[PDB]
From Swiss-Prot, chain A:
This is 3C-like proteinase nsp5. The gene is rep. It catalyses: TSAVLQ-|-SGFRK-NH2 and SGVTFQ-|-GKFKK the two peptides corresponding to the two self-cleavage sites of the SARS 3C-like proteinase are the two most reactive peptide substrates. The enzyme exhibits a strong preference for substrates containing Gln at P1 position and Leu at P2 position. There is a cross-link at residues 3, 88 (Glycyl lysine isopeptide (Lys-Gly) (interchain with G-Cter in ubiquitin)). It is found in: Host cytoplasm; Host Golgi apparatus; Host nucleus. The lineage of its organism: Viruses, Riboviria, Orthornavirae, Pisuviricota, Pisoniviricetes. The chain holds residues 3266 to 3568 of 7096 of the full protein. The active site is at 39 (for 3cl-pro activity), 143 (nucleophile). Inhibited by pyridone-containing alpha-ketoamides compounds 13a and 13b. In turn, alpha-ketoamide 13b (tert-butyl (1-((S)-1-(((S)-4-(benzylamino)-3,4-dioxo-1-((S)-2-oxopyrrolidin-3-yl)butan-2-yl)amino)-3-cyclopropyl-1-oxopropan-2-yl)-2-oxo-1,2-dihydropyridin-3-yl)carbamate) inhibits SARS-CoV-2 replication in human lung cells. Inhibited ex vivo by michael acceptor inhibitor N3. Inhibited ex vivo by compound 11a and 11b. Residues 1-303 are cytoplasmic. It comes from the Viruses. It comes from Severe acute respiratory syndrome coronavirus 2.
Length: 303, 299
């Protein structure tokens, strides 16, 4: 039960640095376009209440320094799409993988390639919380780092990093520049909603425990989805959607345990204790493994 | 505070598939040599009690099928170095990074690139345990997956995967083919020695907790190095050396908590327990971050 990231090599070949004035951050170079946070056009003075449309009309193509390593890529056009800048460059990235842009749902996991000055530094797995933040690891200069999943030969980009909230958690946009959650890219006071436990992932973890022979928590009872959802909210657990029930299908089939039967078992654990007992050796329930993460580590999918 | 692995791209470019007969595993292609576990030359029957020198002399270059994705590489020589087979191929790998082969010490961490059929599957961070096992995530066909660290531009390869023990932990060799630990590449149940907790790593992690505002376990007390080590050994923790105290220097400087002060806090947790509380979200004392790992992630 390791938190396993996707291999990062296909994304590494797409990272560049983008500088405007003295502000440097990371960009993503796909075909002949570089994507990066529009915050790069701000000075320290602009960050409090930036007027991005006004800041951008005073920039031209030759104000942007795009480098792949120490090699400059000439900028030939620029536009703003929500909170991302799109810089058209004169060279198509020969390392461009097959890719798509996707907007993920809370509870989904993805790998983050943390970068500084356009150089990859580390990779880790994390989950999108129900309050649209991620518990990441990001230092100054990390903006423009991306999150991604790999789906056979296709890289699905789902996150670009923009900010850190005063509570220490992180927020960003999809690759169309739309924020996850109710945040804005300005250095203002912002707070996230209360975090909840990701129920669908806890259920995936319970199925993984059963697959490995740890099944003391199974009981003789079942529940309805509506009854379960109403109880879950009382314990700060996310309600299940119909999509959550369907993505649990394969694990339910593999173990022969119906989804709603597993819900009844989880409902028992919430109302009574765990009695100091453990599941997969842990005293606490894990909620950052999705159903697909469980299948990955029990089957060994490659890319 | 996350377990962060090194970016794997430099190693992905070196991974190939090696097949001998009915056995397929992964190999590492550097310049014009492919390194892989010698177990690839065994049948199911052979694996029970292999005489590797005999099995190797009975093979020719054409019994080895090496595939780099779609392209077959032609084997033009072969030799055995301890538990690793070196296959000479007619083509140099243009994506060979700057690299070195190092043998690591218990307590040190590295990234694993788990591969199947020559294709990368996942990356995660591990520590070499004091009993010379690693707690990995490896399935059938993962042999020849490698462990590595990245220093500036240089890839240091430190581990090649060979086996899973009955307890579910893993064992392998360095890239010179020498096992870590008392294990042999034979299909028999092998036990490892008693494991201990890596004390210097726990302290580094407690410093990371303080950096991130988790402070409940601190106290005003201090201890001596010898008095701490007496308690540590009683609880199956590795003793702390003066070398370890030196290496914790930067975290001590950044937090203003002396190392021996932190030791007094860890001593209390060992004696009293954590009492249902958590540190950095964990209910257990984590020992697979080195001091360098913490420094890397925190500044
Ligand atoms: C971009 O590299 C940077 C990433 C931050 C720096 C520390 N760790 C991170 O994840 N982002 C910013 O500096 C960002 C700038 C735009 C939002 C305009 N601002 C930010 O994260 O401010 C933090 C903050 C703002 C207001 C109150 C409290 C904290
Ligand atoms: C190589 O791909 C494979 C990796 C194993 C398979 C399951 N998980 C892994 O990490 N290694 C072997 O199959 C290895 C071959 C020897 C000749 C080195 N044998 C092995 O790991 O045996 C496990 C075992 C446990 C208990 C009794 C007997 C064998």
């Amino acid at each position: 039960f390791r938190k396993m990231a996707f291999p990062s090599g296909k994304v590494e070949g797409c990272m560049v640095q983008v500088t405007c004035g003295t502000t440097t951050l990371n960009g993503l170079w796909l075909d002949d376009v570089v994507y990066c946070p529009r915050a790069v056009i701000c000075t320290s003075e602009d960050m409090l209440n930036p007027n991005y449309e006004d800041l951008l009309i005073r920039k031209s193509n030759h104000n942007f320094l795009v480098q792949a390593g120490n090699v400059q890529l000439r900028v030939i056009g620029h536009s703003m799409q929500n909170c991302v800048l799109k810089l058209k460059v004169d060279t198509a990235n020969p390392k461009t993988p097959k890719y798509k842009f996707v907007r993920i749902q809370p509870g989904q996991t993805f790998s983050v390639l943390a970068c500084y000055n356009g150089s990859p530094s580390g990779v880790y797995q994390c989950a999108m919380r129900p309050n649209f933040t991620i518990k990441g690891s990001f230092l100054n200069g990390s903006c423009g780092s991306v999150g991604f999943n790999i789906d056979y030969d296709c890289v699905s980009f789902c996150y670009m990093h923009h900010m850190e909230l005063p509570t220490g958690v992180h927020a960003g946009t999809d690759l169309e520049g739309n924020f996850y959650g109710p945040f804005v890219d300005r250095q203002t006071a912002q707070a996230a909603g209360t975090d909840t436990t990701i129920t669908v992932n806890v259920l995936a973890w319970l199925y993984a425990a059963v697959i490995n022979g740890d099944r003391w928590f199974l009981n003789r009872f079942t529940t309805t989805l509506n009854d379960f959802n109403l109880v879950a909210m009382k314990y700060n657990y996310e309600p299940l959607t119909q999509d959550h029930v369907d993505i649990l299908g394969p694990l339910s089939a593999q173990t022969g345990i119906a989804v709603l039967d597993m819900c009844a078992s989880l409902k028992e654990l919430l109302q009574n204790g765990m009695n100091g007992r453990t599941i997969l050796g842990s005293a606490l329930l894990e909620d950052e493994f999705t159903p697909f993460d469980v299948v990955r580590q029990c089957s060994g999918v490659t890319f």
